[PDB]
Write a protein that binds this ligand. Structure first.
Ligand SMILES: Cc1cc2nc3c(=O)[nH]c(=O)nc-3n(C[C@H](O)[C@H](O)[C@H](O)COP(=O)(O)OP(=O)(O)OC[C@H]3O[C@@H](n4cnc5c(N)ncnc54)[C@H](O)[C@@H]3O)c2cc1C
Ligand SMILES: Nc1ncnc2c1ncn2[C@@H]1O[C@H](CSCC[C@H](N)C(=O)O)[C@@H](O)[C@H]1O
Ligand SMILES: Nc1ncnc2c1ncn2[C@@H]1O[C@H](CSCC[C@H](N)C(=O)O)[C@@H](O)[C@H]1O
Lengths: 230, 582
């Protein structure tokens, strides 16, 4: 037993599942053993870039939208930057904001509803376990989300997100709700039951904000998702 | 379902319900006319035409290797111009071997659409189509001429319809009709075609009247009688060709609208007769963007979305020099090689010794050459009073994006920095910008500053001496006709001067600087001194020896500024070089 007590001994509701993400999104106290440094999806500590949006992620996951990775809108930082920088020196580095998460089944309706106004700017992709696949993405084509331009060189594009790779990743992206977390609990115990109601019948989601010279809209998508549900 | 060439391409438009247009031309009897018509093919291609049809006659030697011959005109339309063509063919006074040889030659030239014609004095187009199918299978498109008001040689119209049945069922793919004067005639013979089991799509042909010779030309071509209404309209204006052009445009617009609104017409064939204005106006009245180069090439070149910037003021030589390739670049340019040098036209749109009045008959010194570049860039008339339309490297008026590089560019060019290609830094403008908005309409477009020029031995030396003060920021490349090569670019890698960011797509980089393909542009760039401007002068003269000295000893230089969100340093590097001189 290493991560059980860090993820909580007994889950009273989905709120006890939300309470595991916020204690990963900040170093914070717990009923026993304090800080948790891991989730099934998130074996790295938060990258230094995450400090730009840590307060937003804490807000988002405390509202029940269960973020499992992100990026900010960077708009051409120097390559040498210790927070957001890579490749040859002196060049530039760019990003699109990114927000990948799970939600309660009722919340996916809410998200699709609010995307009816942002479906030009925000590339979105929702998927339930067994298959229920909704997107505004180009049918086939990958979306580039981190790229860089370097003195005397070709454009480098290290981070890309796309509907085929996402539909493949989904088959692991649900399995470890059981294989890592759910397998800790007793057979059909109230914790296992609320985890199974979170494994099955629950939407994995991806969002990308394409308009990177602007402030990141993904927080407003989630705020309006919440508002709508409310 | 899947789609391919042949009927499936036009079946795509049929299913999508998109109306299209096609143009049909004639081969000229002179080489100059051939060049003019090739330029015309380039100009019409932007009108979104389905295909180009080239007529065939035996008196003009169409199967021969003369440039005026129809076969080479069609080949130039496709291979060296990038436009799909449909080749007409007639087999009167021809044998099996001749037809087979001509069809094989069409094979070798990439020609894949063939029109079957019987001509006027192998007895029928049925034999031609059947022989084509038997000897070359289904590799080629086959289309047969249709006769709505019946063949003049035929006793009965129903017999003509039956012969059309047989010809279509033999090997034909599409049917093209001749001139008309009433729309209802289209409908009646279309219904006849349907009722006889002919299921191929029928496309109507249109002759746009443009002059008084059109009436005689129309009568001779179609053997039909002009209606008394049109003649009476034309008779009182028998010497106002321009007015008849407007009247014919109106009549053609009415006919085309009636044809299209029917829904049985998938497209239109227009008999241009090697005339542009009326056809273009008609097409516009009936109702460019994917890359900063306004068209990517058609034949075997759907893959091209990156090419080197060097040729971008002169694109048709790049297409011609690269026609050997299969690896037409898509992705990071990283592969296609111009391991090539060639025999040529090297002719402007102005005649061979006509533009001498704009470049000057008499070069006094290099300081006269320096004004020809500046007169071009300024749009200013020469000492003769003639505005310079082009220079040997750049047959165009230079682009709207280079209006940002007007006053500074011509200012530094006066000083012996003879610029032949250039570009602004852009810093992430929205897509659909008026001067740099290429690609998908949502997104952003980005560019580095670029400058390319010839310059003197002294000024090149100076610049080599200076660039050390910017060499972290400026990639530079310098070469001469002697092959002396000096450059500061990493491992000779390409340099991505333009790119765009678009929702849901990977990053797109449509133009690139490349120090290896600059070795292949170099030879073309220097040779365009002697082979267009030197040879425009007499064989031993001040003007020839001046141009041969410029060819012999100027450096060719290219610079790129990598700090694209900051102000351009190419302005304030050549000025940092002018200072040093003194
Ligand atoms: C779109 C178009 C393009 C043209 N292009 C050219 C060109 O490139 N070069 C050129 O020289 N001319 C061309 N012409 C002119 C054309 O070739 C003439 O109309 C010519 O006189 C006959 O050619 P055809 O294919 O229409 O002949 P066909 O369709 O074969 O018709 C000619 C006559 O053959 C008779 N016939 C056909 N099959 C039979 C049969 N099985 N049994 C008995 N009788 C039969 C018909 O009754 C008809 O009157 C073109 C015409 C059109 C409309
Ligand atoms: N549950 C969670 N909520 C928010 N962010 C998370 C998260 N789990 C991981 N992350 C962060 O999401 C980031 C995605 S990393 C992939 C993109 C990468 N930064 C690049 O541009 O190359 C990680 O760096 C990590 O710090
Ligand atoms: N004599 C001359 N001096 C300066 N620039 C010239 C020139 N002749 C042509 N040019 C310009 O050279 C540029 C090269 S193409 C520039 C790159 C490309 N348009 C892009 O897609 O980003 C053209 O804009 C052309 O107009």
């Amino acid at each position: 037993e290493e991560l059980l007590k860090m993820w909580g001994e007994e889950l009273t509701s989905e709120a006890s599942v939300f309470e595991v993400f916020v204690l990963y999104l900040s170093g914070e106290p717990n009923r026993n053993g304090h800080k948790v440094t891991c989730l099934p999806w998130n074996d790295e500590p938060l990258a230094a870039e995450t400090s730009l949006l840590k307060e937003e992620l804490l807000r988002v996951n405390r509202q029940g939208i269960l973020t499992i990775n992100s990026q900010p809108n960077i708009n051409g930082k120097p390559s040498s930057d210790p927070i957001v920088g890579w490749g040859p020196s002196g060049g530039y580095v760019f990003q699109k904001a990114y927000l990948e998460f799970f939600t309660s089944r009722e919340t996916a309706e809410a998200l699709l509803q609010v995307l009816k106004k942002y479906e030009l700017r925000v590339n979105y992709h929702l998927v339930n376990v067994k298959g229920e696949n909704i997107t505004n993405a180009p049918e086939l084509q990958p979306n580039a989300v981190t790229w860089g331009i370097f003195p005397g060189r070709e454009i480098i594009q290290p981070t890309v997100v796309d509907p085929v790779s996402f539909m493949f990743w989904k088959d692991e992206a649900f399995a470890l709700w059981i294989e890592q977390w759910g397998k800790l609990y007793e057979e059909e115990s109230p914790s296992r039951t609320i985890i199974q109601y979170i494994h099955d019948n629950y939407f994995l989601v991806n969002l990308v904000d394409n308009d990177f010279p602007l402030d990141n809209c993904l927080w407003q998508v989630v705020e309006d998702t919440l508002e709508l549900l409310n």
